[PDB]
Design an enzyme around this catalytic site. Structure first.
Site, PDB file in Angstrom:
ATOM      1  N   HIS A 201       0.808  -1.210   0.000  1.00 13.03           N
ATOM      2  CA  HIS A 201       0.000   0.000   0.000  1.00 13.03           C
ATOM      3  C   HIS A 201       0.849   1.272   0.000  1.00 13.03           C
ATOM      4  O   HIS A 201       0.281   2.369  -0.025  1.00 13.03           O
ATOM      5  CB  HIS A 201      -0.975   0.000   1.171  1.00 13.03           C
ATOM      6  CG  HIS A 201      -0.404   0.107   2.557  1.00 13.03           C
ATOM      7  ND1 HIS A 201      -0.280   1.324   3.198  1.00 13.03           N
ATOM      8  CD2 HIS A 201      -0.073  -0.850   3.478  1.00 13.03           C
ATOM      9  CE1 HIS A 201       0.135   1.116   4.451  1.00 13.03           C
ATOM     10  NE2 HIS A 201       0.268  -0.195   4.646  1.00 13.03           N
TER      11      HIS A 201
ATOM     12  N   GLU B 215       0.180  -8.319   0.646  1.00 12.28           N
ATOM     13  CA  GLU B 215       0.474  -7.001   1.149  1.00 12.28           C
ATOM     14  C   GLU B 215       1.975  -6.715   1.194  1.00 12.28           C
ATOM     15  O   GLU B 215       2.407  -5.757   1.838  1.00 12.28           O
ATOM     16  CB  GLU B 215      -0.431  -6.723   2.346  1.00 12.28           C
ATOM     17  CG  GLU B 215      -1.741  -6.074   1.881  1.00 12.28           C
ATOM     18  CD  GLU B 215      -1.688  -4.564   1.587  1.00 12.28           C
ATOM     19  OE1 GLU B 215      -0.637  -3.867   1.796  1.00 12.28           O
ATOM     20  OE2 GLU B 215      -2.762  -4.082   1.170  1.00 12.28           O
TER      21      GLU B 215
ATOM     22  N   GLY C  90       2.181   4.793   9.368  1.00 15.08           N
ATOM     23  CA  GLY C  90       3.584   4.853   8.980  1.00 15.08           C
ATOM     24  C   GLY C  90       4.516   4.259  10.042  1.00 15.08           C
ATOM     25  O   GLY C  90       5.687   4.617  10.103  1.00 15.08           O
TER      26      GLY C  90
ATOM     27  N   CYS D  71       3.613   1.279   9.351  1.00  9.67           N
ATOM     28  CA  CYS D  71       3.709   0.525   8.124  1.00  9.67           C
ATOM     29  C   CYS D  71       5.173   0.522   7.685  1.00  9.67           C
ATOM     30  O   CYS D  71       5.956   1.490   7.885  1.00  9.67           O
ATOM     31  CB  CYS D  71       2.627   0.893   7.112  1.00  9.67           C
ATOM     32  SG  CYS D  71       1.034   0.192   7.571  1.00  9.67           S
TER      33      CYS D  71
END
Length: 182
Positions: free
Chosen positions: A40, A71, A145, A147
């Protein structure tokens, strides 16, 4: 202590902050010119890495044999610098741990080490239609973030944070077969 020392070693050597269209992210370097990020994060034709624009050659977004997204995305980079090879440290099979460390490295969360405890297998994460496979789960108050964050237990890199909620983080598991043979 040994779990921790490992995580710090890994961060020094193989984790960098990468900026995209979508913002900064923790990124792992795996070998050579290859690295992984959350799908993403949506990496373009180039990515900034510790100040510098770097051309992205290939970008592979991983799916399972059903075409369900995992992902994770592999990116090969136009660069001279090579990464310490950590394929030996990535397990052949989806791995759990009682003593996970989550590693995050952005400007908001620089060189930040979070022991989350138990990382368990949950396999299929079916939220909305947006289903996913090979996920891990752990107690962690997720924001944003984080992430790209990396999950370690001693000697192994097992996962990559891609999701969460108030009380839990979700990672995509890492398997050595996602990369080239050694």
């Amino acid at each position: 202590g040994p779990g921790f020392d490992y995580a710090v070693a890994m961060a020094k050597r193989n984790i960098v902050t990468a900026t995209t269209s979508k913002g900064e992210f923790t990124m792992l370097g795996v070998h050579d010119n290859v690295a992984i990020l959350p799908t993403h994060a949506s990496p373009g034709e180039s990515i900034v890495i510790d100040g510098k624009e770097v051309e992205i050659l290939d970008a592979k977004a991983l799916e399972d044999q059903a075409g369900t997204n995992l992902e994770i995305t592999i990116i090969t980079l136009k660069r001279n610098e090579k990464f310490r090879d950590i394929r030996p440290h990535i397990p052949t099979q989806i791995t759990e741990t009682n003593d996970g460390v989550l590693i995050v490295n952005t400007s908001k969360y620089p060189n930040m080490y979070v022991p989350v405890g138990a990382v368990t297998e949950q396999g299929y994460l079916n939220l909305g239609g947006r289903q996913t496979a090979r996920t891990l789960m752990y107690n962690f108050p997720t924001r944003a973030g984080q992430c790209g964050g990396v999950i370690t237990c001693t000697g192994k890199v097992i996962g990559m944070h891609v999701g969460g909620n108030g009380s839990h983080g979700f990672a995509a598991a890492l398997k050595r077969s996602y990369f080239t043979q050694s």
